[PDB]
């Protein structure tokens, strides 16, 4: 199946890199991830992205990554959750 | 051309209507009748069928419930004898679940659903009444397995399973030990699929084990809310009754019209083989018989005393009508109606076992846990 997967940049776990200035698309061993703002495609990579690679190819599902912009990891502000949660 | 649809029925009076049903269905290329009453034994059962087959070159046969209450051995020879020639046989009032097996009964049909179809009714009862934990108490015979097997398959449609499927040998005497296992089970809904005499054994052990009190729900089929079962059944049993199950006249008239509908559909066929005129000499297959059965698969009759007559893939009746009825104050009173798809309950109240007016939960969670540990020093 196809799942929409949210993420967020953290230094060792989800590293977000700019796309190739020449090719214009993401590199090898590095998955793409969008960034709403304009709508920008970036390249995601890290410890947690590798786990997602092995899981997806073993659980047999496809995904499209996108970085959260509403917030961060997540917090409950007046009964509503913002961020990855 | 003369086509006979001769039958094998007891109740000589009812056989007269079969001739009358034939004599009235033809007006709506000729139909006849050569019905013969039931002999006592079962060896002469098969020999009579050939003699009827010889005298009329019968196309299809009718078999109904005799005075003998076995309901399993008496109707067998008609299907077995006519199964050699691939001649379809209509099971007017034979509700045993065995006849749905095409391997054993190559050419056999039914105007009434088998006892195994009552599990389809119980499925909708759980949906209406919000039950998900049940205990099956089924006999080890084929009828018990059939009720178990269909219920289990449809339970995975909603991704659910029975809590326990306790089985007992047919005609068992010490059933109490088996029901003791259902005591510690969390589920309170009990589904029983025993026979006329086995049901009372389960009922008598439940009463002394206090399993017919408050909180218990008994879902029960046709055979265990009739006969000797009602003598020992506790208050609040929620059984099932076929609305037109015992209407022999309805099935005779309905079956004649159903076959005669497909009779007129055999004209537009190539290389039709006549039915054998003698059972003694014939050894062929009469391949039009399977073709006649295949046409008779979709031959749905417009109306009837029993309603629309539609046949399943295995030859059983489709979209039958059931009545849901409790046993209040030792009196079996109708409480609901099953229309073949959903459950329609009446405005009448339901007396649950133990006299509870409100619907019991149907599941009691055990708060006493057994916990296994190991010797590890810090822990």
């Amino acid at each position: 199946d196809h799942l929409s997967i949210v993420t967020l940049e953290e230094a060792p776990f989800v590293i977000v890199e700019s796309v190739d200035p020449l090719s214009g698309t993401c590199m090898r061993n590095t998955v793409p991830c969008q960034k709403r703002i304009g709508y920008i495609k970036k390249c995601c990579k890290g410890f947690c992205i590798d786990i997602l690679k092995k899981i997806s190819k073993s659980v047999k599902f496809t995904y499209d990554l996108y970085l959260v912009t509403n917030g961060k990891h997540g917090k409950k502000i007046n009964g509503t959750w913002n961020g990855m949660i | 051309k003369i086509v006979n649809i001769g039958a094998v029925l007891s109740t000589r009076k009812h056989e007269q209507m079969f001739r009358e049903a034939v004599n009235q269905a033809n007006k709506r290329i000729q139909l006849n009748a050569t019905s013969v009453t039931h002999k006592p034994n079962a060896i002469q059962m098969a020999l009579s069928v050939c003699e009827d087959l010889i005298s009329s070159q019968v196309y299809a046969i009718l078999v109904s419930h005799p005075p003998t209450p076995n309901d399993h051995f008496t109707p067998t020879p008609v299907s077995y004898t006519a199964g050699f020639y691939r001649i379809p046989v209509l099971g007017l009032t034979t509700r045993m679940s065995i006849y749905s097996d095409k391997s054993i009964h190559l050419s056999f049909l039914r105007t009434v659903p088998p006892y195994s179809h009552q599990s389809s009714v119980w499925f909708e009862m759980m949906r209406v009444y919000s039950w998900n934990h049940i205990i099956l108490l089924v006999s080890d015979d084929h009828e018990g397995r059939a009720a178990q097997k269909r219920l289990e398959t449809l339970l995975e449609e909603r991704e659910s399973k029975a809590e326990k499927v306790l089985q007992f040998d047919p005609g068992t005497k010490n059933v109490t030990a088996l029901l003791m296992e259902a005591k510690e089970l969390e589920a309170r809904v009990i589904i029983l699929s025993a026979s006329e005499d086995d049901a009372a054994t389960v009922y008598r052990a439940a009463a002394m084990l206090n399993m017919t009190g408050s909180g218990y729900v008994w879902l029960v089929g046709e055979r265990e809310i009739s006969g000797n079962a009602l003598r020992y059944a506790p208050d609040g049993i929620l059984g099932l009754q076929l609305i037109n199950g015992k209407n022999e006249s309805a099935h005779i008239s309905d079956a004649v019209g159903v076959v005669a509908q497909a009779v007129h559909e055999l004209l537009e066929k190539e290389n039709i083989t006549d039915p054998p005129r003698g059972c003694v000499g014939n050894t062929n297959i009469w391949k039009t018989g399977p073709l006649f059965k295949r046409v008779l698969m979709s031959s749905k009759y417009a109306d009837g005393v029993t309603g629309r007559v539609e046949f399943n893939e295995d030859g059983d009746r489709k979209f039958a009508n059931y009545s849901i009825m409790n046993l209040q104050n030792r009196k079996l009173v109708q409480v609901g109606i099953y229309n073949g798809t959903h459950v329609i309950p009446n405005d009448r109240k339901i007396i649950w076992p133990g006299g509870e007016t409100e619907k019991p939960r149907g599941y009691q969670m055990s708060t006493r846990l057994k916990i296994v540990t190991i010797h590890q020093e810090p822990f």
Partner: protein, 359 residues
């Protein structure tokens, strides 16, 4: 003496069967065995009831051994009913009587020389164990033995150290009108090297033709099918893929008179055991009138002995449903032409080898 009648249908080597009667040795069993070889044609179901009833009424035969040549299962049902009322065991040596009927009567003592759907399915797992085939795909129609075939496979796959992998249990259906398109999409969802097809002989042709429409009948695949589709090995619908594997009974190494001696031995050996311990002589009422009133007398104790009989070291023991726990099974393969050839044998849960390394 114990009255045993061998009723034969169609052409047979009756002379050799007669010689086998003298070559029998049941002297140690102390049974005084009697054999009444009776021959007839296919005739009719009306005759077979009256023929056996006449034989029972004449010399009060205790057991019946039946052989047949036609490939129709309607003979097996009649024999089961005859044993149900006459209370006389019948043996399905060959032909229609050897066709296996899944569900019998509870009080019948009718047994057949053949495997069950489960035993064939268990055998099918054996041939894949040796060749290291562990990827599955089960395709079954609405045949009444489809859901026992799947259950037996699923039971052996689970909790077993052998690493299997079952992909699809595709359930086909052909009662739908003009449903060829509908059955086409379902069959395309197959990506396994091995397919364990279970259907009927004519239903297989429809399935194989649809697979022939996709063209993936055999090119890098393998289909394993029970003996139901194989049927008459002399006839091939010319659509069965090359490399088709099937499981068959011992219908070539065992001749028609080969089983008659064993069938007679089974009854006599069973009757020997009851005489040593119970010492009872069964004399059922030979009349065929009011046989329901004759149900008071029963031979269930004797039926406890026909279940377990060992002769010559071969466990020719019957199940409670009339199967054989230790039957002789063979494996048949399609060569380049259209001909069934042996590629193995099965005995005592051990799969005997002739051709080892698959091509």
């Amino acid at each position: 003496s114990i009255g045993i009648a061998v009723i034969l249908v169609g052409t047979s080597d009756e002379v050799a069967i007669k010689d086998a009667h003298e070559k029998d040795d049941f002297h140690h069993l102390s049974v005084v065995p009697r054999v009444e070889l009776v021959a007839m044609n296919e005739t009719d179901p009306k005759s077979i009831i009256t023929r056996i009833c006449d034989l029972m009424s004449d010399r009060k035969i205790q057991g019946v051994v039946f052989a047949d040549d036609t490939d129709q299962e309607a003979i097996a049902q009649i024999l089961d009913f005859i044993s149900a009322q006459t209370l006389t065991p019948i043996l399905g040596i060959h032909g229609g009587s050897s066709m296996i009927m899944a569900d019998k009567d509870e009080s019948s003592m009718f047994f057949q020389f053949g495997p069950s759907i489960e035993q064939q399915a268990s055998v099918m797992l054996n041939i894949m164990e040796e060749y290291d085939w562990y990827i599955f795909s089960i395709v079954t129609t609405y045949f009444p033995g489809y859901q026992d075939f799947v259950n037996k496979i699923r039971s052996t796959i689970e909790n077993s150290f052998v690493g299997w992998e079952l992909e699809e249990v595709l359930l086909l259906d052909m009662s739908l009108d003009d449903g060829d398109s509908k059955i086409q999409n379902q069959l395309k969802k197959l990506q396994s090297p091995i397919i364990l097809l279970y259907c009927t002989k004519e239903e297989a042709t429809y399935i194989f033709e649809v697979a022939n429409s996709v063209g993936l009948t055999g090119y890098g695949y393998t289909w394993i099918v029970p003996s139901l589709v194989a049927g008459d090995t002399d006839t091939v619908p010319a659509e069965f893929p090359t490399g088709l594997i099937s499981v068959s009974y011992d219908e070539w190494d065992y001749g028609l008179p080969a089983r008659v001696r064993d069938g007679i031995a089974i009854i006599t050996t069973a009757a020997s055991d009851m005489l040593s311990e119970h010492s009872f002589i069964p004399e059922p009422k030979s009349s065929c009138y009011n046989t329901h009133e004759k149900r008071i007398y029963q031979s269930n104790m004797l039926n406890r002995y026909l279940i377990n009989v060992t002769f010559e070291g071969r466990n020719l023991s019957f199940s409670e449903d009339g199967y054989q726990m230790h039957p002789k099974l063979v494996i048949i393969l399609l060569n380049k032409e259209r001909k069934w050839e042996r590629v193995g044998k099965w005995k005592d849960k051990s799969l005997q080898m002739k051709y080892y390394v698959w091509p």
